RNA sequence: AAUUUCUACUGUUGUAGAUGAGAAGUCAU
DNA sequence: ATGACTTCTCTAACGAGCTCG
DNA sequence: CGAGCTCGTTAGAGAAG
């Protein structure tokens, strides 16, 4: 059970609501310019950080290249490491942390104490101070613009003069900045994180900079080769000034070689970004741009080395690619224009395409189709591939499906011809061992040598042969006369698309446009389709060359090779007519205020300018002006003591790390509250603290319990004396009974948070709004209304209790601040789509009514047609006890009092069904047992599989004319949030733990949906403040950090091996394990040797074969089988008319064993005639008949008929076939597929039931430890 | 086809569920 | 071209700096 | 020039598979 299970830790969500214009303030919003002059600004803040970061660039261009050299310690860090990566030894992994935290202080040292860093991150970067000049524009001006560095061309603002105008119109505006004034301290930081700059070079540079020393002077040993120092040095010329030297002494310029390179000492050459781009460009290759091809590079002579030897060992030691630094830079068509432009522009390229004989495309490729028709050239200099692009030809003119389709294989497959059978069944779980190069190509020479002999098949002399198409292009150049005359029907579109700055092609009144234009793109469709039939891919078998000739394929390159930017275009325009409209910026309203709503708080309501409202749950916000900023003051709230509506009092404590030492010791106030001697002593020298720091100017000493308690007697001594926050009410615990300074401020921001309520008259609110000294907002989504016939939102079931009266007794919903405002400009002209009172038809087909009718009217979407504000505000729930670490094992120690109690859940994947829960208790009976894809059980009951059936039909729409609306790009992640609830109404409810599939597409994009969707979990419908409320109810899972350290346990989703539960029988559990393949005809008769006797039933009626598996080596597991030939079993086939073809068990074997001179009617071993007989279609024939004796699964035409057969016997002498199953067994085959993780999980509550006094109990599961325990609960 | 936003709906100027937001950061099925 | 995953804050009050007093 | 004076810093605790 859960019932003590609340209130665990805290959580950061984020109320959304819109903002309803009331009184007349949008009348006012409009009457100044707080819009139009908005989004000027909150679209050039995010345009003032490519005037920000092309500066932190230019900043690094100089604190890593020509400075902070760690010199020589990089010998003391490769000790620490080559050694270190065999052993880990307390000798050298904490030497590991010797140079890491000794490079980064010989770095971070010069970085925290650098030129331009101190005056970077405070007002002196834009505008400093008066009379000054600030860093910025100091850049700008006195260096960038008198030296003439071009770099703001290459954007989209025009030039530096313009950019310093952004510049200036932020005057004021820097504390808008603390959230990209904190993505910097990051990237100058010198910490543990992986953000860095620093760690970028300590941490994932050099570590991986001494494999590439390392693997370089053993790359010395065998070393012949014609590196461009033995023959020429001019290449890298200029790319290798090197006007520095980091080895002994700074040389002017001289050219370093590679002696200087993979230096230990030279490292400090290769640090900043400026250094990866010559480190991975003499590894990479540079291009030239003066007719030149790629020159050479170090891994470019690894493969000129392997001209002498073929090794596969030759290529493992070359040279990796550093990463690059953070922030620096080299230096989705949703424009309208490029739509009509890409293929106007394309559409020139015909006649200025030229072919390689100073011809056009028609002026030479016209005479070129009409030449060679009788095939009289070499049509042998072709070369094919047999995996997937083989099926074209067939396909395309012989119209089969698995006659033409398999007479390439067979002759192909036996080149070296050792094999025997095929089918291989598993296939789990990995793809290779060493290395495997085996053993087929493609070509057209095995067309005619596999087809040819088909083709005198016929009886008259005019078959198909494989050389009678070869005149297939009589009209290749009237060919593209037909896209030439559907070109000048487009001066319509592109008049009716000539605004840039719209996307106004894709709109509901361009739906029947959308066939000029896909209908356009009929006429070069198909014809790409046919297009890859003239070159074949990349499909080599080491040696792609195929005598390729430049006589029939001269000319192919020169057109052809331009034609496929309609591949590029086709393939470009596609997801643009398939996204839905939304056409936004969704920019920050700012009111005219860099602080707008940091916080809610009275002493400082006049500069966040944002004030909440009451009345009569129907919330409310307040905006002033920042002119009139003092307009709810202590004065004009005495008078205004009215009614109306309530006004909130966030009173707030943040930081107590950072607040109760900022007021009790500094210059205005130290004299008032009268530190001691002994006291300010401790604050001296950070005496109270275990990692505090001192006042500047002393030293860190001893932590002392004495000199902390004391210090926390301070406290008590200070806040009472403190003008407002004796109005709290703290009441702390004794200080005997505090441990250090953290277990103290657990009682003071969890207590640091009042909010009261003073009313103002609505008159007054009236006045001020309409005279323009207000702005007053309404908080609105579809739970406040009247029209609220039943169950509110979650984010409006939280809204409504922050302001709750039982939620200030003692609160478990902070309002957090910090928030914002947004607006959404329009994207869509409101066309009704519905008109009045018609009927309207359904689209669910579950449904007792047929129709709707619907007085007023429905647009299509109502939420884009309306310029809306939006307003985003945290909170913070379980904000007076957080905490939970170790939460993983914290609710293992649940558990253990609740044994013989708790059920276990367990959740497949699959597209037959989509998931299949089964409530698995302690003992395997199961008690529920549903699917997924009828969902949504309140009264509606809508289905899931039924409607991806026809969007698994998708790949049809978007062919013909370019059209594809049929949401398959969402409704993947979509329909896992209503399972989500789902299967949480179950874990509540049935006591219930859950178990998973551990992966070790949307595949596992719904795990990551019940880790967040459980941090805290509430049901809308229970009563308030009781057991699983909206105040106190259910945290059972700590939260999703990835899902690589997701691990076996991430709350109560346990995690099982995804390995072998769908092929076993429930009530004994056989696997077959052993694989039946059929090497060759003796070689598997020492298979069949192996039974225990191979008797027949003349008791009941089929044969049995019974084994053991110990007498083979894999080694599965122990037990006498009994195995049978009971059940009809189905078998699938190449479908395109043979997709099931039904084979009985004992009928196949008594028409095969009696075909032969086997007589075995009388019962007993028939191993010796079976083991005797030798024949080449016997075996082939039998084992595939013991393939599918064992086939446990049968589908007819999967889905809808997909039941469950099993082989083996019980101790009841009885099958399992599920359609005469009792309730508590599985039923379908998911079902048997969802079952053994439901009882794979059940032996993870045996090890956690049973856990040791040493803690430490590992939840991985061996195969062997599940593959006995099923068999064995009996 | 109505939404704080997304999907699915008629569940009737909405019902049932879901929900962490901004701005950066590297990098890969 | 989307999914990965590491990081910040989720903020009141003092005090340098300011326009004048 | 002490009031005032509006906007930017600045006070800096703590678990670790």
């Given at each position: 059970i859960y019932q003590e299970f609340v209130n665990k830790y805290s959580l950061s969500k984020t109320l959304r609501f819109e903002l309803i214009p009331q009184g007349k303030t949008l009348e006012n919003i409009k009457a100044r310019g707080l819009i139009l002059d908005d989004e000027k600004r909150a679209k050039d803040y995010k345009k003032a950080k490519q005037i920000i970061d092309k500066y932190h660039q230019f900043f690094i261009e100089e604190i890593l290249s020509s400075v902070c050299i760690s010199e020589d310690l990089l010998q003391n860090y490769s000790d620490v490491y080559f050694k270190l990566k065999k052993s880990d030894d307390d000798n050298l992994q904490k030497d590991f942390k010797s140079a890491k935290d000794t490079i980064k202080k010989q770095i971070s040292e010069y970085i925290k104490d650098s030129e331009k860093f101190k005056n970077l991150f405070n007002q002196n970067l834009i505008d400093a101070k008066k009379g000054q000049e600030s860093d910025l524009i100091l850049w700008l001006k006195q260096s960038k613009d008198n030296g003439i560095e071009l770099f703001k061309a290459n954007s989209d603002i025009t030039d530096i003069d313009e950019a310093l105008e952004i510049i200036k119109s932020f005057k004021g505006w820097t504390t808008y900045f603390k959230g990209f004034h904190e993505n910097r301290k990051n990237v100058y930081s010198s910490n543990d994180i992986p953000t860095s700059i620093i760690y970028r070079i300590v941490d994932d540079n050099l570590p991986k900079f001494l494999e590439n020393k390392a693997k370089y002077e053993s790359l010395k040993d065998k070393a012949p080769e014609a590196i461009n120092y033995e023959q020429i040095?001019?290449?890298?010329?200029?790319?290798?000034?090197?006007?520095?030297?980091?080895?002994?002494?700074?040389?002017?310029?001289?050219?370093?070689?590679?002696?200087?390179?993979?230096?230990?000492?030279?490292?400090?050459?290769?640090?900043?970004?400026?250094?990866?781009?010559?480190?991975?460009?003499?590894?990479?290759?540079?291009?030239?741009?003066?007719?030149?091809?790629?020159?050479?590079?170090?891994?470019?002579?690894?493969?000129?080395?392997?001209?002498?030897?073929?090794?596969?060992?030759?290529?493992?030691?070359?040279?990796?690619?550093?990463?690059?630094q953070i922030l620096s830079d080299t230096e989705k068509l949703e424009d309208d224009s490029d739509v009509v432009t890409t293929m106007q522009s394309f559409y020139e390229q015909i006649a200025a395409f030229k072919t390689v004989e100073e011809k056009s495309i028609k002026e030479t490729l016209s005479l070129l189709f009409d030449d060679l028709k009788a095939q009289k050239l070499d049509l042998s200099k072709i070369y094919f591939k047999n995996d997937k692009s083989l099926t074209d030809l067939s396909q395309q003119v012989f119209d089969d499906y698995s006659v033409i389709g398999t007479a390439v294989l067979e002759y192909i497959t036996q080149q070296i011809a050792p094999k025997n059978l095929d089918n291989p069944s598993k296939k789990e779980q990995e793809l290779i061992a060493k290395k495997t190069e085996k053993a087929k190509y493609l070509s057209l020479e095995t067309i005619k040598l596999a087809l040819e002999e088909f083709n005198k098949h016929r009886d008259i002399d005019k078959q198909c042969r494989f050389e009678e198409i070869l005149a297939n292009?009589?009209?290749?150049?009237?060919?593209?006369?037909?896209?030439?005359?559907?070109?000048?029907?487009?001066?319509?579109?592109?008049?009716?698309?000539?605004?840039?700055?719209?996307?106004?092609?894709?709109?509901?009144?361009?739906?029947?446009?959308?066939?000029?234009?896909?209908?356009?793109?009929?006429?070069?469709?198909?014809?790409?389709?046919?297009?890859?039939?003239?070159?074949?891919?990349?499909?080599?078998?080491?040696?792609?060359?195929?005598?390729?000739?430049?006589?029939?394929?001269?000319?192919?390159?020169?057109?052809?090779?331009?034609?496929?930017?309609?591949?590029?275009?086709?393939?470009?325009?596609?997801?643009?007519?398939?996204?839905?409209?939304?056409?936004?910026?969704?920019?920050?309203?700012?009111?005219?205020?860099?602080?707008?709503?940091?916080?809610?708080?009275?002493?400082?309501?006049?500069?966040?300018?944002?004030?909440?409202?009451?009345?009569?749950?129907?919330?409310?916000?307040?905006?002033?002006?920042?002119?009139?900023?003092?307009?709810?003051?202590?004065?004009?709230?005495?008078?205004?003591?009215?009614?109306?509506?309530?006004?909130?009092?966030?009173?707030?404590?943040?930081?107590?790390?950072?607040?109760?030492?900022?007021?009790?010791?500094?210059?205005?106030?130290?004299?008032?509250?009268?530190?001691?001697?002994?006291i300010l002593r401790i604050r001296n020298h950070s005496t109270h603290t275990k990692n505090g720091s001192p006042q500047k100017g002393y030293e860190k000493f001893e932590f002392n319990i004495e000199d902390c308690?004391?210090?926390?007697?301070?406290?008590?001594?200070?806040?009472?004396?403190?003008?407002?926050?004796?109005?709290?009410?703290?009441?702390?615990?004794?200080?005997?009974?505090?441990?250090?300074?953290?277990?103290?401020?657990?009682?003071?921001?969890?207590?640091?948070?009042?909010?009261?309520?003073?009313?103002?008259?609505?008159?007054?609110?009236?006045?001020?709004?309409?005279?323009?000294?207000?702005?007053?907002?309404?908080?609105?989504?579809?739970?406040?209304?009247?029209?609220?016939?039943?169950?509110?939102?979650?984010?409006?079931?939280?809204?409504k209790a922050l302001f709750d009266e039982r939620n200030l007794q003692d609160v478990v919903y902070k309002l957090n601040g910090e928030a914002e405002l947004f607006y959404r400009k329009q994207s869509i002209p409101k066309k009704i789509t519905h008109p009045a009172k018609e009927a309207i038809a359904n689209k669910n087909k579950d449904n007792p009514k047929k129709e709707s009718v619907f007085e007023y009217d429905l647009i299509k979407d109502k939420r884009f047609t309306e310029d809306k504000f939006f307003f985003h505000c945290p909170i913070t729930i379980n904000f007076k006890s957080s905490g939970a670490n170790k939460f993983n094992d914290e609710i293992n120690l649940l558990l253990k009092e609740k044994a013989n109690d708790v059920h276990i859940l367990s959740i497949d994947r699959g597209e037959r069904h989509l998931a299949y829960y089964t409530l698995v208790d302690g003992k395997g009976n199961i008690i529920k047992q549903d699917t997924f894809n009828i969902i949504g059980n309140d009264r509606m009951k809508t289905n899931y599989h039924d409607k991806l059936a026809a969007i698994e039909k998708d790949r049809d729409s978007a062919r013909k004319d370019w059209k594809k609306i049929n949401n398959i790009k969402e409704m993947k992640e979509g329909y896992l949030s209503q399972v989500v609830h789902e299967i949480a109404?179950?874990?509540?409810?049935?006591?219930?733990?859950?178990?998973?599939?551990?992966?070790?597409?949307?595949?596992?994009?719904?795990?990551?949906?019940?880790?967040?969707?459980?941090?805290?979990?509430?049901?809308?419908?229970?009563?308030?403040?009781?057991?699983?409320?909206?105040?106190?109810?259910?945290?059972?899972?700590?939260?999703?950090?990835?899902?690589?350290?997701?691990?076996?346990?991430?709350?109560?989703?346990?995690?099982?091996?995804?390995?072998?539960?769908?092929?076993?029988?429930?009530?004994?559990?056989?696997?077959?394990?052993?694989?039946?393949?059929?090497?060759?005809?003796?070689?598997?008769?020492?298979?069949?040797?192996?039974?225990?006797?191979?008797?027949?039933?003349?008791?009941?009626?089929?044969?049995?074969?019974?084994?053991?598996?110990?007498?083979?080596?894999?080694?599965?597991?122990?037990?006498?089988?009994?195995?049978?030939?009971?059940?009809?079993?189905?078998?699938?086939?190449?479908?395109?008319?043979?997709?099931?073809?039904?084979?009985?068990?004992?009928?196949?074997?008594?028409?095969?064993?009696?075909?032969?001179?086997?007589?075995?009617?009388?019962?007993?071993?028939?191993?010796?005639?079976?083991?005797?007989?030798?024949?080449?279609?016997?075996?082939?024939?039998?084992?595939?008949?013991?393939?599918?004796?064992?086939?446990?699964?049968?589908?007819?035409?999967?889905?809808?008929?997909?039941?469950?057969?099993?082989?083996?016997?019980?101790?009841?002498?009885?099958?399992?076939?599920?359609?005469?199953?009792?309730?508590?067994?599985?039923?379908?085959?998911?079902?048997?597929?969802?079952?053994?993780?439901?009882?794979?999980?059940?032996?993870?509550?045996?090890?956690?039931?049973?856990?040791?006094?040493?803690?430490?109990?590992?939840?991985?599961?061996?195969?062997?430890?599940?593959?006995?325990?099923?068999?064995?609960?009996?």
């Amino acid at each position: 059970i859960y019932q003590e299970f609340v209130n665990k830790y805290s959580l950061s969500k984020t109320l959304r609501f819109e903002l309803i214009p009331q009184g007349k303030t949008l009348e006012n919003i409009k009457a100044r310019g707080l819009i139009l002059d908005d989004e000027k600004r909150a679209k050039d803040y995010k345009k003032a950080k490519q005037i920000i970061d092309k500066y932190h660039q230019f900043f690094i261009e100089e604190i890593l290249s020509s400075v902070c050299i760690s010199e020589d310690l990089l010998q003391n860090y490769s000790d620490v490491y080559f050694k270190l990566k065999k052993s880990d030894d307390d000798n050298l992994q904490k030497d590991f942390k010797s140079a890491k935290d000794t490079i980064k202080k010989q770095i971070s040292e010069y970085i925290k104490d650098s030129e331009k860093f101190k005056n970077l991150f405070n007002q002196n970067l834009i505008d400093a101070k008066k009379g000054q000049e600030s860093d910025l524009i100091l850049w700008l001006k006195q260096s960038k613009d008198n030296g003439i560095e071009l770099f703001k061309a290459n954007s989209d603002i025009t030039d530096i003069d313009e950019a310093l105008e952004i510049i200036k119109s932020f005057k004021g505006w820097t504390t808008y900045f603390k959230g990209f004034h904190e993505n910097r301290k990051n990237v100058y930081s010198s910490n543990d994180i992986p953000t860095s700059i620093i760690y970028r070079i300590v941490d994932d540079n050099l570590p991986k900079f001494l494999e590439n020393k390392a693997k370089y002077e053993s790359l010395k040993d065998k070393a012949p080769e014609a590196i461009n120092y033995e023959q020429i040095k001019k290449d890298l010329a200029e790319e290798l000034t090197f006007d520095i030297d980091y080895k002994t002494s700074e040389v002017n310029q001289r050219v370093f070689s590679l002696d200087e390179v993979f230096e230990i000492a030279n490292f400090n050459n290769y640090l900043n970004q400026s250094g990866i781009t010559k480190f991975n460009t003499i590894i990479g290759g540079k291009f030239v741009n003066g007719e030149n091809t790629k020159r050479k590079g170090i891994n470019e002579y690894i493969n000129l080395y392997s001209q002498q030897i073929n090794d596969k060992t030759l290529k493992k030691y070359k040279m990796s690619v550093l990463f690059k630094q953070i922030l620096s830079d080299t230096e989705k068509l949703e424009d309208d224009s490029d739509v009509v432009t890409t293929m106007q522009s394309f559409y020139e390229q015909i006649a200025a395409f030229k072919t390689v004989e100073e011809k056009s495309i028609k002026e030479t490729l016209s005479l070129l189709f009409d030449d060679l028709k009788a095939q009289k050239l070499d049509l042998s200099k072709i070369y094919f591939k047999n995996d997937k692009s083989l099926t074209d030809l067939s396909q395309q003119v012989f119209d089969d499906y698995s006659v033409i389709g398999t007479a390439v294989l067979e002759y192909i497959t036996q080149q070296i011809a050792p094999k025997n059978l095929d089918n291989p069944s598993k296939k789990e779980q990995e793809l290779i061992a060493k290395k495997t190069e085996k053993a087929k190509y493609l070509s057209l020479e095995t067309i005619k040598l596999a087809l040819e002999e088909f083709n005198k098949h016929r009886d008259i002399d005019k078959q198909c042969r494989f050389e009678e198409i070869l005149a297939n292009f009589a009209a290749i150049p009237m060919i593209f006369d037909e896209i030439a005359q559907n070109k000048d029907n487009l001066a319509q579109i592109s008049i009716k698309y000539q605004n840039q700055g719209k996307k106004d092609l894709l709109q509901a009144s361009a739906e029947d446009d959308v066939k000029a234009i896909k209908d356009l793109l009929d006429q070069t469709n198909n014809l790409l389709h046919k297009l890859k039939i003239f070159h074949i891919s990349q499909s080599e078998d080491k040696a792609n060359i195929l005598d390729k000739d430049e006589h029939f394929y001269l000319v192919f390159e020169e057109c052809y090779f331009e034609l496929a930017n309609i591949v590029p275009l086709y393939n470009k325009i596609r997801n643009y007519i398939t996204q839905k409209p939304y056409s936004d910026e969704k920019f920050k309203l700012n009111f005219e205020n860099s602080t707008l709503a940091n916080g809610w708080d009275k002493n400082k309501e006049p500069d966040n300018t944002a004030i909440l409202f009451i009345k009569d749950d129907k919330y409310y916000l307040g905006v002033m002006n920042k002119k009139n900023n003092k307009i709810f003051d202590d004065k004009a709230i005495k008078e205004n003591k009215g009614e109306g509506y309530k006004k909130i009092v966030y009173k707030l404590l943040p930081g107590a790390n950072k607040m109760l030492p900022k007021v009790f010791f500094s210059a205005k106030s130290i004299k008032f509250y009268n530190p001691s001697e002994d006291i300010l002593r401790i604050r001296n020298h950070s005496t109270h603290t275990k990692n505090g720091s001192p006042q500047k100017g002393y030293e860190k000493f001893e932590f002392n319990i004495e000199d902390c308690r004391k210090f926390i007697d301070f406290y008590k001594q200070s806040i009472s004396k403190h003008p407002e926050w004796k109005d709290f009410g703290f009441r702390f615990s004794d200080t005997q009974r505090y441990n250090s300074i953290d277990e103290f401020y657990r009682e003071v921001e969890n207590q640091g948070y009042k909010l009261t309520f003073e009313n103002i008259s609505e008159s007054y609110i009236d006045s001020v709004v309409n005279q323009g000294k207000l702005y007053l907002f309404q908080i609105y989504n579809k739970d406040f209304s009247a029209y609220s016939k039943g169950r509110p939102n979650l984010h409006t079931l939280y809204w409504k209790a922050l302001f709750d009266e039982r939620n200030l007794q003692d609160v478990v919903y902070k309002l957090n601040g910090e928030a914002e405002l947004f607006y959404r400009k329009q994207s869509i002209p409101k066309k009704i789509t519905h008109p009045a009172k018609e009927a309207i038809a359904n689209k669910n087909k579950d449904n007792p009514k047929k129709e709707s009718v619907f007085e007023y009217d429905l647009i299509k979407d109502k939420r884009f047609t309306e310029d809306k504000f939006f307003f985003h505000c945290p909170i913070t729930i379980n904000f007076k006890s957080s905490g939970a670490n170790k939460f993983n094992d914290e609710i293992n120690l649940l558990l253990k009092e609740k044994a013989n109690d708790v059920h276990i859940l367990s959740i497949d994947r699959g597209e037959r069904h989509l998931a299949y829960y089964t409530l698995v208790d302690g003992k395997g009976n199961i008690i529920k047992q549903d699917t997924f894809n009828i969902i949504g059980n309140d009264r509606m009951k809508t289905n899931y599989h039924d409607k991806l059936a026809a969007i698994e039909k998708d790949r049809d729409s978007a062919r013909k004319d370019w059209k594809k609306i049929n949401n398959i790009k969402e409704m993947k992640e979509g329909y896992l949030s209503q399972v989500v609830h789902e299967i949480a109404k179950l874990v509540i409810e049935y006591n219930a733990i859950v178990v998973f599939q551990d992966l070790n597409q949307v595949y596992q994009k719904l795990e990551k949906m019940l880790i967040e969707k459980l941090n805290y979990l509430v049901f809308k419908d229970n009563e308030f403040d009781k057991t699983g409320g909206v105040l106190r109810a259910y945290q059972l899972t700590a939260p999703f950090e990835t899902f690589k350290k997701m691990g076996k346990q991430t709350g109560i989703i346990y995690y099982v091996p995804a390995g072998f539960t769908s092929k076993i029988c429930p009530v004994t559990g056989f696997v077959n394990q052993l694989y039946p393949k059929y090497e060759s005809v003796s070689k598997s008769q020492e298979f069949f040797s192996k039974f225990d006797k191979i008797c027949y039933n003349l008791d009941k009626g089929y044969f049995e074969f019974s084994f053991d598996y110990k007498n083979f080596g894999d080694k599965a597991a122990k037990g006498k089988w009994t195995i049978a030939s009971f059940g009809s079993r189905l078998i699938n086939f190449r479908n395109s008319n043979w997709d099931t073809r039904e084979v009985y068990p004992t009928k196949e074997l008594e028409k095969l064993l009696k075909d032969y001179s086997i007589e075995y009617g009388h019962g007993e071993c028939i191993k010796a005639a079976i083991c005797g007989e030798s024949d080449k279609k016997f075996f082939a024939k039998l084992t595939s008949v013991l393939n599918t004796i064992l086939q446990m699964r049968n589908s007819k035409t999967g889905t809808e008929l997909d039941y469950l057969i099993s082989p083996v016997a019980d101790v009841n002498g009885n099958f399992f076939d599920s359609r005469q199953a009792p309730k508590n067994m599985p039923q379908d085959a998911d079902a048997n597929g969802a079952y053994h993780i439901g009882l794979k999980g059940l032996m993870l509550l045996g090890r956690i039931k049973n856990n040791q006094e040493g803690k430490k109990l590992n939840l991985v599961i061996k195969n062997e430890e599940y593959f006995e325990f099923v068999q064995n609960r009996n």
